[PDB]
Amino acid sequence: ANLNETGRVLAVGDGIARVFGLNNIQAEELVEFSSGVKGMALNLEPGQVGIVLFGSDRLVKEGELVKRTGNIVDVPVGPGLLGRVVDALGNPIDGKGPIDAAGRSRAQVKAPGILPRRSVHEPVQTGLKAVDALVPIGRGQRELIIGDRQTGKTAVALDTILNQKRWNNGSDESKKLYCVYVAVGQKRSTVAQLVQTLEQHDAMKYSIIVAATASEAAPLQYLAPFTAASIGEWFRDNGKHALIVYDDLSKQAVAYRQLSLLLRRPPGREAYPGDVFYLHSRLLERAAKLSEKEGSGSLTALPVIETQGGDVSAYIPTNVISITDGQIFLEAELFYKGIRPAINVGLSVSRVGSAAQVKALKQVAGSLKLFLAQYREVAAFALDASTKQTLVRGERLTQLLKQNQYSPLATEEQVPLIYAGVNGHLDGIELSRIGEFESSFLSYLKSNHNELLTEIREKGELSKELLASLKSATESFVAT
Amino acid sequence: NLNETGRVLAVGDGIARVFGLNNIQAEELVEFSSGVKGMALNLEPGQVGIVLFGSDRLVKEGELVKRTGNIVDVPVGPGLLGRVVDALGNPIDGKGPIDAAGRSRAQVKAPGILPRRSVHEPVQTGLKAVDALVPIGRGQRELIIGDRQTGKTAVALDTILNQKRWNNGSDESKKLYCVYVAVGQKRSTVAQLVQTLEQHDAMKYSIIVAATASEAAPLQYLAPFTAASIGEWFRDNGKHALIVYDDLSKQAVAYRQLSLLLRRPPGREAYPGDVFYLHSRLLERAAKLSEKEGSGSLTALPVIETQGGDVSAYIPTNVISITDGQIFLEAELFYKGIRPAINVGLSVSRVGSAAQVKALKQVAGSLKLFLAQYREVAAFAQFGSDLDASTKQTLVRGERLTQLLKQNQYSPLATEEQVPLIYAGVNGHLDGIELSRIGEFESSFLSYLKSNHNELLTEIREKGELSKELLASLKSATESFVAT
Amino acid sequence: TPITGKVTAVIGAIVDVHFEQSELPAILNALEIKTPQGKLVLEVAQHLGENTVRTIAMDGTEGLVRGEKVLDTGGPISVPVGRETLGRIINVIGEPIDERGPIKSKLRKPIHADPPSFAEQSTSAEILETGIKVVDLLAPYARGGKIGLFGGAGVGKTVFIQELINNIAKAHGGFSVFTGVGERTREGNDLYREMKETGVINLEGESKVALVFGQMNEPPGARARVALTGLTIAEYFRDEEGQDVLLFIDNIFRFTQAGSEVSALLGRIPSAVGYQPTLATDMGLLQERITTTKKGSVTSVQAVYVPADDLTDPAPATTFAHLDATTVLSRGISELGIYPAVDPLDSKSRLLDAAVVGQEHYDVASKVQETLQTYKSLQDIIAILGMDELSEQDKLTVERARKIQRFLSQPFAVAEVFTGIPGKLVRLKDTVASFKAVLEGKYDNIPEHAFYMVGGIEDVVAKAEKLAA
Amino acid sequence: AEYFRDEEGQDVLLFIDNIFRFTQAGSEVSALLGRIPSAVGYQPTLATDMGLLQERITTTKKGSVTSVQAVYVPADDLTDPAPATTFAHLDATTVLSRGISELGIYPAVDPLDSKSRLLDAAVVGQEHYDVASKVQETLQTYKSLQDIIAILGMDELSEQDKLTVERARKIQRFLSQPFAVAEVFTGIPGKLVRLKDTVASFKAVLEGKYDNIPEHAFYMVGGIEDVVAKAEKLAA
Amino acid sequence: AEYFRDEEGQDVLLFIDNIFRFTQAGSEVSALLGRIPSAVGYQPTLATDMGLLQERITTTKKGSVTSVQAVYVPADDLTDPAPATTFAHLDATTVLSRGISELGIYPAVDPLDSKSRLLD
Amino acid sequence: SEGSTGTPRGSGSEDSFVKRARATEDFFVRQREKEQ
Amino acid sequence: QGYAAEISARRNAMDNASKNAGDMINRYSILYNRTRQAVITNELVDIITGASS
């Protein structure tokens, strides 16, 4: 009985074990119980230690032995995690055997300060016409995805991931983007299916999935985004780029509230504890663009928040809006009418986004964001002649920005489409033919103006000569 | 010796738990060896709970605590006039020790049923809207209530400025000594306020009790009580005092703080169980005393700060149900710049005309229901209809009456100045003047009455009434001035 | 040899320490635990009894073991003061975080101090011209005063305070302190670069501004104290150098929030909405130091976050009593595209006063406010029945108010990226005249959009002619 | 009061202002007595505490107690546990209203919300009951019209509808009364109107005998006679 | 239900009427155990309680348990914690309306209000 | 429900719809009382 | 003609006013429920705090 390294369980309940002993235990140290369930040393008091269980209460009894691990809650990290699916503690759950780790990192790592940072300036290309044109995301940014249930939030994140195959297959390491997807509170089957979808599109080989699902103990769900960030940080810290999706942080907050209430911390606004903002701010701060001195790596975050009945004014939504660098707001009414992605243009913004939009796309989309917000305002009140034309464009543009799931487009495919719409060349075509237009126009360009698309892809910018050449190509196709 | 002294067991958040002090009285002042003072509020079997009247930075475990033998008290007397003190009577103006006639407990029983007499004397605010529509009497408690920056302090401050007329005189029975209590306000707000009082030579008859926002919660809790005792010295010795409690919202919050930290289980909204009592026992101390007891009085103007006009909130509703009516300041009015922003229909004085100068009661016969006759026809205009030419008469009048009741700050009017103005407005002598010139009309009309009808004003001033002779003399002087 | 204790308890930010000997450290003292990285600073909060004190950590406590040795420094957390802080970046415990070596200041001062006494107050009524139409017209700021910018998540607090820095901080003459409390680390990175590029900070020369940061990545102890740190530096410029100091704080709510994270750990029964019972006093002990004395002036601009858009939330609610002027930003106004999203009714100033701004100014404001009020009052009818159901006098007022609403909007220079529209800085005098003229009816023939997002009235006329083309 | 009732055999009157302050007082010390609070900051013993007081204020075979209790209603909320729990103890309830009072109608009695055990044909006679019932129907129907008037205006009201409006408006005013003790507030000397007067006067108005008399005649007066007298006085 | 799936490789139906009562009973038990109630009075473990049931209703290699659940909506508020948490698990809805059926249509299912994540 | 739009409850609970109901109505009574 | 134009315009306005009112009802229903939830939580928090001490 070495009471320094070891302890006896005094009581167990409400996800908590009170333990006698463990005199040399560190605050926030991982422990192991007889049955093999793990826990975290939360309160070191005199004569006892309060331990939060990473599993069911059934797995711990009074009188049972508990052992120190010697480790603050940590997680394996490194490129060997690519293609794998793990639980909140980094255990493989995909059946493919042990993880090959470059090392271990603590779950809680303080975000970089002012000095190791540099402003974001590189694009995160989503492949979604509406996002890349209207709310472009940069590497190192945090961009909230927010809306009610079944408004397309996961789908936005999933299409962004599928889009990365374009560079992740190339040899240019700076353009690559490794993807971390964090399922918090989700259905296990949903996550299993999502992983199959990623495998079907050959996206899994550059993705890591950290899952803490609806039946897993609240602390595991609370933990998953942090261990996941540490996993993402390995890329950030070693001159590379990662994208992490927290799907979703509403459910992480609910799991953290469960613990807080069971530990008897005073409930505040909507019963959440006082530190529920800090839960999210400590997390999202870790996404960052690092300076040259620091390797130039980045971690970009797409946290997800589910609102209830459009309530963006609620505690958690407002917490996260006041952490991130903008939001993509997804609206149920637009989703119902088949406007998908269901982006509310007027409420969606990307703070540090313009500096990191592909220039060609910036050029062809001038006013597109303001116009669309104004157009919707007009369509709401709607036979003035001027306001009949604004109505003509916006209807075409709206239609143009619709996109099927799982079909992200290259930037050189997006600019010709947006150029057409924004410059009237669709004002004449029938609404029901805009989709037919897109695929035909792209086929045409891919076989007749391939060098056009090539210069757009390679230079990322349009000269007066290249712009004019694009005008010619559009008019020529419009006629036929 | 554990009977007269004690030892700090624990201290934090302005609370000290003390071993010993066996003979201590509930609510007794104690001294800590570092110099800070406290008040014993919890007497429990093994320990005493003490709330600190200062910082606990210097209190420590094991440190000695000494009984003072005294229930928490404050200095009182006329020597406090022109002074600025903290909640315990310590000077904070930098003008040396307080000239005290004696010492009163902070908590003192209100006068009973018997020692009182019905409120019958005016507290003349000098505010046209107040004095005419919601007159306040000596011994009355009248609430001032409204959102922040709606004019609440301004109303009370003008009232204090007005008392200059009688205080400069020698007749002690018409004098009104002023106590201003700053509870949870910024120091600079209080400093600005006493600068004003000094500039209008009003400090000489004022006493300022200050427990500002950075000061320990027990001081903010206590200030209105010690200030009451200060005001009662006047009440008890045949004189008359006005006390402003600015504000009781912040006092309730301070009471909550210390009570939670004493670990007393809270009630509604975490306020203490007896939060109503906190205010009811305070305001009941305002009273008009009987002839047998010297005829003295204390009049209270408590201030309550609402949020977003919510008068149905816990504490506002508590105080509303205590006072003898309320002056209700509304932001909607204050933004238009109709100031003071008194909602006439909702502001009441439960004492009534009994407290009003008779001359003013005469000239403003219907004025309050006349602004219910006008408020009625205010809805007729956006109805769009252009009828009731008889209505047009009252329709125009009210709009001029509203402009007449507007009043700049720091500019209170004597009754002899008010009475003419109200007479002019009520009888429709204004119905033919332009709205934008009612301002200049006032200051000229009163120049004209001072220049020529100087005996007319002196009449109203001395007699406080209008005889049928004066009523027509004024009528004649009015119809006269209309033609420039 | 110094006084030493042992850690006996750890929960989150709160660390209990036992002292074996007779002498306990005073409340507010800084304690130190030696770490291989350096040291963890602890602030003493309470004496618990039995030779044990409760403390609040200034950094993360993971790793701490019961028994770990603790040293009393004999005094509170202290910070460098004076001109050697200018152009530097400092954390909550006075250490440089800008990788430019020690701050070679003559003196260090404790971050806790009594506010100036009643005797030491010095009151004034000097207007501070901002160049922002809605503020200068309807609720002017006060020199040596306290200014609060209230707003829910994402409505414009930081953009606003940055425009004020842009408009005021260069041509001030005195020094500035900016304190980031519980906000975005990236925003600090941005601000540092921006201040270098305006010369306000000058690494190889003279600097005008000190930067202090403890952002939303920090544990609560640090977020709770870092405002005191920036404040202490401002106090020194004020008292010892008699300076007119600017103190900018984004975001002061984060101090109160931090307080609420540790409150239960400290043993306090919670007050309304889960806040600490010491809410008002804690706030008073901070704000009352941010004031103007006979030795010098402090002008303070503070962003004040509004939880869940609720202005009656205890934190912003209690902040109101401390300010001379208050700009309240509204989500409903921001969604209409009015920036700055100022709520013209609800933002206030001690200074909107004929004695201070002159009768003309005062009266223009009152009429603008009256017009906006009339328009608000009619929102019911408008939305249900339509514009057709108003009187003709009321139609006009609504027309005029909608133009006033738009005319109150303004392109900020720091917003040029968001807007694509060059920043405008409108003189107070021109704001008065321009609005006077609009009230008088002189521009009823001009369409609405011409008032939107411009400067003075000349720009309205200009834009109207452009829109005619 | 109980001694007078039981030993002196008396018919006692017990006046209480204000009975809410009894429940409130209990509230104020409840936490310090060690009780967990109930809803709205009230003691858990609220109902039984009130029972143990109210059930004593009754009428026995030895004698009679008639009590009039003023019941404060915090923030005008009749659902507040304190007033709410009081209703069951009362044979008759006089419900005042800020809405009524702000229209100048004193006493500010809500004509519909106030109730009595004794509003019964068997008790007051079939005439009385019928008058009351149709006054109440008139006032209810009035409310429903005030809606249509708000949106649609006057043009969609039948000729009977407009008559209902007119009569209800007179009825409302006719329910006002100058009180003797309110003399300082009113200026007007107080009136006392016998019950028979009241029923007769209201029946007459319900039938139609005063459809030609303007509103102001019904406001702040006593019986039907004082109406006609005021009507003629305003003619001059 | 699980046994039919695990042992006999079936595609089982599990019916629960009413799922809200499972939630409500969880809340009562939680209150009685002295646990601090969460938003709207529900149990702090609302979402994990639900998860420990729902996650067992799934497809394996042997077969499947599919579940049809009566869902009561307190105060008709779909944003109420009970349905809101339940809905996270729903793959589809069958909405029977009284608006329908009165028109003589059976099964009285609203063909537009009824939705499936699998109509893909 | 009946009178929920039209009838005057407390000042400080007023619609514009309550305000107009009393306006269009008071005018009507005035006209009829004037004629009689 | 002017009469048939006024009925038609009133039927137009009444269709609008009715549609707008419907939206208002939806916005206030949503507001009602947020407030309903908050009141239940807030009332309960008071109770919890009183029980803890």
Ligand SMILES: Nc1ncnc2c1ncn2[C@@H]1O[C@H](COP(=O)(O)OP(=O)(O)O)[C@@H](O)[C@H]1O
């Ligand atoms: N662009 C799209 N076009 C068509 N269907 C889509 C599109 N995006 C998403 N969906 C479908 O909408 C439903 C909900 O989307 P999901 O990503 O689950 O939203 P959420 O994460 O907000 O709950 C899914 O059935 C998904 O297949």
Ligand SMILES: Nc1ncnc2c1ncn2[C@@H]1O[C@H](COP(=O)(O)OP(=O)(O)O)[C@@H](O)[C@H]1O
């Ligand atoms: N009668 C008045 N006329 C003009 N301005 C006034 C008047 N009363 C108050 N004010 C203005 O309102 C500002 C704040 O009013 P104050 O009395 O402090 O309200 P509150 O005490 O409710 O916060 C004052 O600084 C003054 O400028």
Ligand SMILES: Nc1ncnc2c1ncn2[C@@H]1O[C@H](COP(=O)(O)OP(=O)(O)O)[C@@H](O)[C@H]1O
């Ligand atoms: N003055 C402004 N002009 C244009 N847009 C603004 C302005 N102020 C704020 N915004 C918009 O609001 C977003 C959030 O502003 P920010 O100041 O960060 O809000 P906050 O600090 O209150 O959370 C900005 O990125 C911008 O899109």
Ligand SMILES: [Mg+2]
């Ligand atoms: Mg999803």
Ligand SMILES: [Mg+2]
């Ligand atoms: Mg004030």
Ligand SMILES: [Mg+2]
């Ligand atoms: Mg900000």
